[PDB]
Amino acid sequence: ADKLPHTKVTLVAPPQVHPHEQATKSGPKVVEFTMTIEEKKMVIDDKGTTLQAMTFNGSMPGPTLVVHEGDYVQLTLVNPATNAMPHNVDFHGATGALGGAKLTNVNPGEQATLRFKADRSGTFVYHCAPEGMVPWHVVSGMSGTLMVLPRDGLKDPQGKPLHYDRAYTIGEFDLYIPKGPDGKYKDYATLAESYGDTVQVMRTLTPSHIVFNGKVGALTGANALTAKVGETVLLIHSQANRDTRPHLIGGHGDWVWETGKFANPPQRDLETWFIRGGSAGAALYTFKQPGVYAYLNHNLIEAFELGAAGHIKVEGKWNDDLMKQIKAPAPIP
Amino acid sequence: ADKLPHTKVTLVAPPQVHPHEQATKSGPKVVEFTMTIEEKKMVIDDKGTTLQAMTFNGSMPGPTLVVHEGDYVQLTLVNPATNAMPHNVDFHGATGALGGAKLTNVNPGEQATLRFKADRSGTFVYHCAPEGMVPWHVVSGMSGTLMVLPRDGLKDPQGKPLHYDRAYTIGEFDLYIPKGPDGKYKDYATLAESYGDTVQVMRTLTPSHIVFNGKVGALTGANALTAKVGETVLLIHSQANRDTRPHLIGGHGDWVWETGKFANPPQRDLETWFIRGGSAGAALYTFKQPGVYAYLNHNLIEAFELGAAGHIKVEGKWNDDLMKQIKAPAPIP
Amino acid sequence: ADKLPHTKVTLVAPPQVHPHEQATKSGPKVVEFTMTIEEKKMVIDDKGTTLQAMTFNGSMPGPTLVVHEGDYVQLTLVNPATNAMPHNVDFHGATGALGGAKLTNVNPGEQATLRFKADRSGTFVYHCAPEGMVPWHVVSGMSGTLMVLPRDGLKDPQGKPLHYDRAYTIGEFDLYIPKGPDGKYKDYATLAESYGDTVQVMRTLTPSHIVFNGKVGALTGANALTAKVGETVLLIHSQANRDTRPHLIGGHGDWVWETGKFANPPQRDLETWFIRGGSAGAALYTFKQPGVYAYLNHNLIEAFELGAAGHIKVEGKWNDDLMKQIKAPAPIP
Ligand SMILES: [Cu+2]
Ligand SMILES: [Cu+2]
Ligand SMILES: [Cu+2]
Ligand SMILES: [Cu+2]
Ligand SMILES: [Cu+2]
Ligand SMILES: [Cu+2]
Ligand SMILES: [Zn+2]
Ligand SMILES: [Zn+2]
Ligand SMILES: [Zn+2]
Structure with a gap:
């Protein structure tokens, strides 16, 4: 060395x-x-x-x-x-x-x-x-x-080459914010003063919030992830403390190392994968449809109520072969 | 198309x-x-x-x-x-x-x-x-x-054919039923009136009940699943919101796609497998012994206390090679 | 037979x-x-x-x-x-x-x-x-x-032989100890008297303690696991009721059967693996560095607050190639 x-x-x-x-x-x-x-x-x-x-x-x-x-x-x-x-x-x-x-x-x-x-x-x-x-x-x-x-890049189960065109990194954080007797979250003047009350909430094993990258809605609006049809994205997902189950709404995990270790063959076609608390996992996906996707923890309470959800805005041309609205919502005949 | x-x-x-x-x-x-x-x-x-x-x-x-x-x-x-x-x-x-x-x-x-x-x-x-x-x-x-x-049916890790003779579908539902100040579950006159109280229970991440196919005991008694020795059953298990860990008591998952995607090789000989919240998985099992099996979520609190358990009644001839009672319960000599 | x-x-x-x-x-x-x-x-x-x-x-x-x-x-x-x-x-x-x-x-x-x-x-x-x-x-x-x-011993994904030099067995127990109105844990004179109160705690799905081998700190101090650099240890981890995510701090799972069934190929290089409630899994690791490791459930609240952590004390010679302190903690220049 x-x-x-x-x-x-x-x-x-x-x-x-x-x-x-x-x-x-x-x-x-x-x-x-x-x-x-x-x-x-x-x-x-x-x-x-x-x-x-x-x-x-x-x-x-x-x-x-x-x-x-x-x-x-x-x-x-x-x-x-x-x-x-x-x-x-x-x-x-x-x-x-x-x-x-x-x-x-x-x-x-x-x-x-x-x-x-x-x-x-x-x-x-x-x-x-x-x-x-x-x-x-x-x-x-x-x-x-x-x-x-x-050193020779990512490989599929048959040893064929795999790649991504863009990488995004998502840290998911189970947070343990205490409440006072009025039922409102407590604000602390210093880091040390938050400690005892926070340990108490931690011990309940129930997060008050679960957030991607530091805040509810961190990866939404102006801050949504982006891609284009035909582009392959790597989604790195870390959860250092608690299990999560990532899912791309309207998409898949084309190739996923849910335990996150590249010398193992990836799984294909996943709807939802599992990141063990204390680990980082990796998923590849090639976009085939434009639009706004959600990328979320598929405990949907954890996603929608607690904050574990983001957006990916994808440019490109719609593919009617993959999906078509045959009849738009209309009165029942 | x-x-x-x-x-x-x-x-x-x-x-x-x-x-x-x-x-x-x-x-x-x-x-x-x-x-x-x-x-x-x-x-x-x-x-x-x-x-x-x-x-x-x-x-x-x-x-x-x-x-x-x-x-x-x-x-x-x-x-x-x-x-x-x-x-x-x-x-x-x-x-x-x-x-x-x-x-x-x-x-x-x-x-x-x-x-x-x-x-x-x-x-x-x-x-x-x-x-x-x-x-x-x-x-x-x-x-x-x-x-x-x-299109060519299920395959094992070596690409050999696999099949089932009967398929069963099990949806597992984590339910979030509110209680009133008396500690009894609340009954609501309309769907809209259940909403606010239910969101509150959801946010605790603690289900009041966890049920297969809509009710405690849904897959028991007259409504138990059935099979016979020699028959291969597919057990489809969906959980759209929360993780579960299916197990067949007295049996195994002979071939299991716990992430539920058939282009991946299945695992064999499983005691308990894992269905990620937001996914459906699939297990094959060939019965070798007659009797009543339990099929359950092997968080045994979730199964026995909360409702996540069913039965399979299996016809056929007992196999002493696989299992034999050498000495029945008797006083200690 | x-x-x-x-x-x-x-x-x-x-x-x-x-x-x-x-x-x-x-x-x-x-x-x-x-x-x-x-x-x-x-x-x-x-x-x-x-x-x-x-x-x-x-x-x-x-x-x-x-x-x-x-x-x-x-x-x-x-x-x-x-x-x-x-x-x-x-x-x-x-x-x-x-x-x-x-x-x-x-x-x-x-x-x-x-x-x-x-x-x-x-x-x-x-x-x-x-x-x-x-x-x-x-x-x-x-x-x-x-x-x-x-019968022919453990095998890697390519069918190559694997072995361990020492085996340890770790049972992880989610415990459900009731409290009285004073907030202190209840002590019961008999096993039967613990029953009703314990069922109530179980139903909350929140363990009061989570312990390896019967007690907080069971596998620490005089009772730490032991090994030496160059030795391969098998770590058997059972959890009959609840999911856990084992991790060796400063080490890895060199070869892991997280679902615990040896006819399936193991995964390599794991940081953290997953033992489904109602199962036992197995990990091999060959020590390369001496020192005291922690072996724990990597929900770190469950480990450090609730008790799901042990120690392995490892003899041998430090390897500077694998890890070196280039500059010890010193004032910022
Ligand atoms: Cu720090
Ligand atoms: Cu760690
Ligand atoms: Cu609806
Ligand atoms: Cu969904
Ligand atoms: Cu007993
Ligand atoms: Cu069991
Ligand atoms: Zn102050
Ligand atoms: Zn009303
Ligand atoms: Zn008494």
């Missing part, structure tokens, strides 16, 4: 993923990243509810880091003095020392640099895990995805 | 499935179906609890529609003037326009006809999804299965 | 598994086991909470029984007169008579002997299932694993 070339990557905010190659002729590199932790109060719904949040790089989820199998990930993790809590990082893509958590314990005003070999292909959760407060830091927003692509 | 022969299918009520071929020499057809929506109050347990229900064809689940890969499904959806709500249909087996929901919005007194290409094999959920009230219509009973068989 | 040699196996307490061969030259045998039911009050957490528990062989989970495909399992099940309840056993690995439950109904002071053919490879749940009180007996602790190894 000390023999290898280094490259530095500039991360981009979700739902985008930083530019990268799929299949590559390049040999292994030490790939350098930096992330800066930001604790902040965030508004998470349409009625002004707040979360005392904790983030990698100021976003929920943290940005997606992309490397190739055999690369080394070298992350500089910075915890500014403006934060109140200690933090670290646990990469599910890494081997040893609790995913790196034991080697990256950073108090406010500190930083650390971790290297690990990305020797396994797939999408992998990374998350903060400070001793004694692991679930709180995770549910407050400290998670994201490391994608380790096979 | 406008070049193809049409066939008309008469649907049958669950747990049966309408007559159909598995492997077929027939070429693609436009296959015509009709369904009529019925809103109605239904008794869902042994103590007289009622649900303000919403159904396709008067049953929970709606009937199963069976076609072959490459067929076109052409459904006439009728919403009689006797109903209070608008409805539509979203086929997970279809491509575009939110599964067809955008093209089938029917007010009471209206009907519509949708065609789509069944270009993907598997069992697929269909459900109502009216804008702004999706989860309510789904949990109140508006879902069923479309089965798209491969 | 009446032609075959008999062998008698002495069971060992979890987390160990009794000595056995993987690949074997031996032909089919009738393999004889005995288990004795013990009802007892157990302390399940650090603050003195008790469970009115029910066990096979005095442990949660019951011991793991290991045979080979084609063997016959012959179990003598003893219910001493010191117990208050009737019991039986349902083997998911068996065919007929509700898994054997119908043939093993034992009142206190009775015993029975059941034989069945272990004709399917995999890890399979066994559990008590007395008519009318199935979920209570299961959640109070009456479950364990039967492992049926293929």
